[PDB]
Amino acid sequence: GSEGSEDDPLYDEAVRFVTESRRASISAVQRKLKIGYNRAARMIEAMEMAGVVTPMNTNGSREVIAPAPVRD
């Protein structure tokens, strides 16, 4: 792993994207971040291990575990 482990030029954007979107979808991440599917997925993987996003669901939809910016 090189790009998308914990601190990546766009991971922070992805994590912020998922946290705010309340959903971890690579296609969506790449769409919102204007990144590549592979790149987004890599960062998304980082979200899984990092605890930013929960594993996929029975239907095939991820969730977010990392809190959102409420004030701090």
Side-chain angles (χ1 to χ4, degrees), residues 22-70:
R22 285 288 223 200
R23 69 220 166 162
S25 323
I26 312 165
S27 167
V29 186
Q30 69 138 251
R31 258 178 177 144
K32 224 236 33 162
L33 254 101
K34 283 159 99 75
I35 54 179
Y37 180 101
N38 295 333
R39 168 176 227 119
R42 283 186 203 190
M43 291 130 70
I44 286 283
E45 203 256 65
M47 278 185 244
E48 255 197 311
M49 283 170 56
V52 184
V53 309
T54 78
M56 307 145 142
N57 281 339
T58 177
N59 248 332
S61 307
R62 269 150 89 105
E63 255 163 66
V64 189
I65 7 183
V70 188

